[PDB]
Amino acid sequence: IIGGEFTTIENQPWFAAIYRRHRGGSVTYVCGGSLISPCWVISATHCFIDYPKKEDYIVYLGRSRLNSNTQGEMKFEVENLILHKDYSADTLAYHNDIALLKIRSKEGRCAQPSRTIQTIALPSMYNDPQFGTSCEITGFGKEQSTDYLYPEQLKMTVVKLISHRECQQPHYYGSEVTTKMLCAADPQWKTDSCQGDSGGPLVCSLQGRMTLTGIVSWGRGCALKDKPGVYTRVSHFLPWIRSHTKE
Amino acid sequence: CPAYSXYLDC
Ligand SMILES: N=C(N)N1CCCCC1
Numbered sequence: 001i002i003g004g005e006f007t008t009i010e011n012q013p014w015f016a017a018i019y020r021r022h023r024g025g026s027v028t029y030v031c032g033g034s035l036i037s038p039c040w041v042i043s044a045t046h047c048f049i050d051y052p053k054k055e056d057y058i059v060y061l062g063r064s065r066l067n068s069n070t071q072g073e074m075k076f077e078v079e080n081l082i083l084h085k086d087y088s089a090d091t092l093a094y095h096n097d098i099a100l101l102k103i104r105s106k107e108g109r110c111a112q113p114s115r116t117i118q119t120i121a122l123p124s125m126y127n128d129p130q131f132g133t134s135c136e137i138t139g140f141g142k143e144q145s146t147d148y149l150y151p152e153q154l155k156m157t158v159v160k161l162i163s164h165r166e167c168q169q170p171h172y173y174g175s176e177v178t179t180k181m182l183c184a185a186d187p188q189w190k191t192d193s194c195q196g197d198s199g200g201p202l203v204c205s206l207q208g209r210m211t212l213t214g215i216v217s218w219g220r221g222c223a224l225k226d227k228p229g230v231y232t233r234v235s236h237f238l239p240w241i242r243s244h245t246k247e
Numbered sequence: 248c249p250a251y252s253x254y255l256d257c
Contacts, residue, residue, distance in 0.1 A: 195253040218252040
């Protein structure tokens with residue numbers, strides 16, 4: 001998150017922190033995700049497409065910090081890693097960038113809701129907020145584009161939804177953005193998602209209910225003028241989500 | 248220039 005503010009997991013208690021174990025045993029952060037039911041976390045396929053093997057991953061819930069334990073957190077293996085079969089990418093734009101992780105602790109349990117661990121509602125189909133609506137984004141990604149390190153403490157910020165029309169203009173993204181994606185940015189371009197935020201939630205309050213409107217997917221640079229963040233538009237994937245989770 | 252997700256403009 002470029003700009004924004006520090007936070008803790010109580011303020012985003014569906015947020016899941018996803019890590020990968022390496023051949024020789026070191027563990028590194030991959031991406032964010034969101035708890036949509038006790039046994040299911042939703043994230044972005046590009047985060048997993050190089051290492052598609054479920055045994056490689058660890059998922060935490062109720063974690064506020066990148067490299068230390070938060071009291072109350074829960075740790076899970078990935079029982080199934082489900083990537084979208086229509087995924088595609090060109091160096092920039094990912095299409096169908098959506099993934100499901102079925103989670104299971106070493107005790108064979110799913111998430112148990114607590115003060116730090118809660119689910120986030122999915123949107124109704126094809127039901128998104130008006131462009132110009134402010135929404136929130138959360139993650140442990142870079143705080144500056146040139147940074148070498150990720151922040152140790154979780155961050156959040158606020159960005160405004162931008163119309164497909166504005167985002168499709170050649171000085172924005174042209175044809176790279178489709179109607180299965182949502183753009184969102186700050187009006188000053190001073191805050192945005194960045195590397196390491198992918199997979200995480202774009203949450204918007206749709207008539208009082210906090211809703212997973214988007215999943216961080218891509219963008220050119222971070223907080224760069226005329227280059228919004230681009231998010232998977234969750235309300236266009238409900239059948240996919242319902243099928244793969246009912247599983 | 249081109250052109251990666253995430254990092255720099257170029
Ligand atoms: N929001 C943008 N600019 N991003 C989000 C995803 C990774 C890198 C850049």
